[model samples]
Target: ARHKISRAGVELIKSFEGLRQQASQLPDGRWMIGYGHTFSAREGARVTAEDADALLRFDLLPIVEAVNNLVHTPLTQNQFDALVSFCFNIGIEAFGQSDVLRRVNEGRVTEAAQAMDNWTSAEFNGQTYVLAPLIRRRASEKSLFLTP
Candidate 1:
C-alpha cells in the first residue's frame, strides 16, 4: 500500500511540477528563486519563489505521506486525499496525535468531526476567526471521514 501510494504521489508531483514553479529575487541577490515559499517566508519572512516550492516539497510532502500511512480504514481515494490534504496543512504529527484522528480511528466519526470543529480557536497570531485553511481542510476531512 505504501509503495503504491508513494508511486501515486510521485506521479502527482510530476503531473503538477509546472504549477509549482515560481520566480523571484532574494534579498541576498545571489540566489535565484523559483518554486514555492520558504518556511521563514510563510511564517512572515521575505520569501522567494524557490523558498515557496521548498516549503511545499519539504514540509507538505511529509505530512501527506504521514497521513497516508496513519490511516487505518479502507478509504476511497477522495477520503485518502482529504486526510492527506488536511494533514498537509495542519501537520501530520499534530493530526496523528490528535483526539480527532483517534476518535475517527476508533469509529466515532461524528465525535471526530466535532473534535475537528473544536479546533476553531484563536490562540495564535491574535486572530479572531478559525484559520481558513484549517477550517476548509477539516470540513473536507470530516465529510469524507463520515462517508459510508
Candidate 2:
C-alpha cells in the first residue's frame, strides 16, 4: 500500500512556507505565489486561498509518489509524511541523490535523519548560505521521522 502525508505534515509545511497572495521572489530568485508555490508564478500574480490549498496538494502529489516508490524499507505513516515533506522542499532530483535517501534505504534511519541537516543551505545571488528556517524545518522533519 502507498503511504500518504498526514495533516501534521501539511501544517508543518504551511507554517514554514507561510501564505502569500501576491507573487514574490524567493531567496532562490524564483517567483512564488501562495504557500511556497513556484511553478507558473510570475510578477503581478495573485491567487485565492482556495487556489493556494489546491496548489499545495497538486505539488505534493509527485513528491508523495517519489517517496513511496524510492523508499524500500518499511515505514510508519509519520515517517512517510516526514520524508514526503523533505522531498517536497528539496525537489525530486536532489532527494533522489540525497545522502538521507541513501541512509534510509540502508536501514540507517537515525543517520538518514541526521543527513537532512546537511541540506540547510541555499544558493542566492551567487552566494551560498545556510537558511535559519531550513534549519528549523529540517529539525522538525528529523523529529517527525523518528516518531514511533
Candidate 3:
C-alpha cells in the first residue's frame, strides 16, 4: 500500500532543500544538487529546475514507501507529513530502522517527535556537522512533527 504526503510536506521539503543547480555538500557530508539529488559532486555538476523536480519526485517515491511501511500507528495528515519530511531529509534505510519508527509503532508519538528532533546533527569519524541550517532544519522538523 501507499500513502500520500500533503502539499505542506512537499512545500516544506522544497523550502528547506531550496534549489541548487550546482552540486554542494549537505551538512551530513553528502554531495547533493537539484533539490537534494545526489550524484557525484564533480565541481561543476548541474541540472535545470525541471530536472530537479523530476529527480525529487523519483527520489521521494521510495521514501514514501518506507514511511508507509515502517509506521504502524495511525497518523493525522500533519503527523504523517512530519514523518515524511523527516524521512526525506534522513534516508529510507535509516528512517525505516530508526528509533523514531520504533517509537511510532509503539504509539508513543510525543517520544517519536523527540526522536525526530534528536537527529539534529550528523557526525562521522573525525568529521562533525553542526550548522545553523541543520539546526533550523531540525527545529522545523520538530515543529512540523508536532503540528496538530
Best by TM-score: 2
Give RMSD to native, each candidate.
6.9, 3.3, 4.3
For residues 1-148, what per-residue lDDT tens digits would candidate 2 score against the true structure?
8888887887777777778999998787889988878888888899898888778877798999999999999999889989998998999899999999999999999999999999999888999899998999999999999999
Better of 2 and 3 by TM-score: 2
Comparing 1 with 3 on lDDT, the higher-scoring candidate is: 3
RMSD of candidate 2 to true structure, Å: 3.3
TM for every model, in the order presented, reads 0.54, 0.82, 0.75
Backbone collisions counted per model = 12, 0, 0
Q: How far is candidate 1 from the true structure (C-alpha RMSD, Å)?
A: 6.9
Worst 10 residues of 3 by lDDT: 36-45
Q: Tens digit of lDDT per residue, candidate 3, span 3-111?
A: 7887678777778877989888778677888886775444567889777877777777777788888887788887777788888887888887788889989988889
Q: Please give the distance, in angstroms, between residue 32's alpha carbon in candidate 2 and its true position after superposition.
A: 4.6
Summarize candidate 1's per-residue lDDT along 102-130 as a digit string, tens digits: 87678775776788776655675775776
lDDT of 1 at 135: 67
Assess candidate 3 and give its lDDT. 0.79
Candidate 1, poorest ten consecutive residues by summed lDDT: 3-12
Residue 9 shift from truth in candidate 3, angstroms: 0.6
